[PDB]
Design a protein around this ligand. Structure first.
Ligand SMILES: CC1=C(/C=C/C(C)=C/C=C\C(C)=C\C=O)C(C)(C)CCC1
Length: 250
């Protein structure tokens, strides 16, 4: 069967490339040695069974883990659960019109000293790992909705460029085959400074996936069904509660 053959070919390529001794190639081989066929199929299917292209995706995925080991070193499922229960980030029960999983972040009252940017990215990675077990999601991918209505100047001043770059790299290196769009709503005037900080690190393909809506949600609602969104993202569903997602995942 083509699936089993494709996985075997990807595995052989992982080994063949590592044979060169090239640093990342060697790291990939080491870092995927415990993975099952399902894991390899994610990359294979995301690249329409093009093994070479699947391997390139895998390189970026592993590179992210090499560059940001603090996100993976002492990962505790229990701690990740708490972050998710707190609603950071959230996940909708229904897919959007593109068949995408919709992830959520509402910055209002986010206290970075209580729940760190790193902890939030750990939660993203933990969720995406589970979400990508699903074969439709392996193709359709996901989007992110960011409600910045409550983005304060204090929050803005506290954001570290190294943390913003980490998020860029999560989307651009770890999950680029799956990250499809990010929608910022209700962002204040000083969002411009935050955006400008990140802009140099965004490749053109990723830049084209960033949308900023402010207070006019007309276009936004054309993308994401108002009737699938929680009330704190302008929708008709109950205010987002991280408990439901958390229970489903764990
Ligand atoms: C502008 C912009 C970004 C900035 C995101 C920010 C400012 C996130 C701030 C807080 C958190 C933790 C959100 C969690 O979802 C992205 C994602 C990096 C890269 C694409 C464009």
């Amino acid at each position: 069967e083509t699936r089993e053959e494709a996985v075997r070919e990807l595995q052989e390529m992982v080994q063949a490339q590592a044979a060169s001794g090239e640093e990342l190639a060697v790291a990939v081989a080491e870092r995927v040695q415990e993975k099952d066929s399902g894991f390899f199929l994610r990359f294979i299917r995301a690249r329409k069974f093009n093994v070479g292209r699947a391997y390139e995706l895998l390189r970026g995925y592993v590179n992210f883990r090499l560059q940001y080991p603090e996100l993976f070193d002492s990962l505790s499922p229990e701690a990740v659960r708490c972050t998710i229960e707190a609603g950071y980030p959230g996940v909708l029960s229904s897919r959007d019109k593109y068949g995408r999983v919709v992830m959520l972040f509402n910055i209002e009252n986010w206290q970075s000293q209580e729940i760190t940017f790193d902890e939030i990215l750990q939660a993203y990675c933990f969720i995406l790992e589970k979400l990508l077990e699903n074969e439709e999601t392996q193709i359709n991918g996901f989007c992110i909705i960011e409600n910045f209505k409550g983005f304060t100047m204090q929050q803005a001043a506290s954001l570290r460029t190294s943390d913003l770059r980490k998020m860029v790299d999560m989307l651009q290196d770890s999950f680029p085959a799956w990250f499809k769009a990010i929608h910022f709503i209700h962002q204040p005037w000083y969002f411009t400074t935050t955006y400008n900080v990140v802009k140099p690190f965004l490749k053109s393909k990723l830049l084209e996936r960033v949308f900023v809506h402010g207070d006019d949600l007309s276009g936004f609602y054309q993308e994401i069904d108002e009737n699938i969104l929680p009330s704190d993202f302008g929708g008709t569903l109950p205010k987002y509660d991280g408990k439901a997602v958390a229970e489903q995942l764990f």
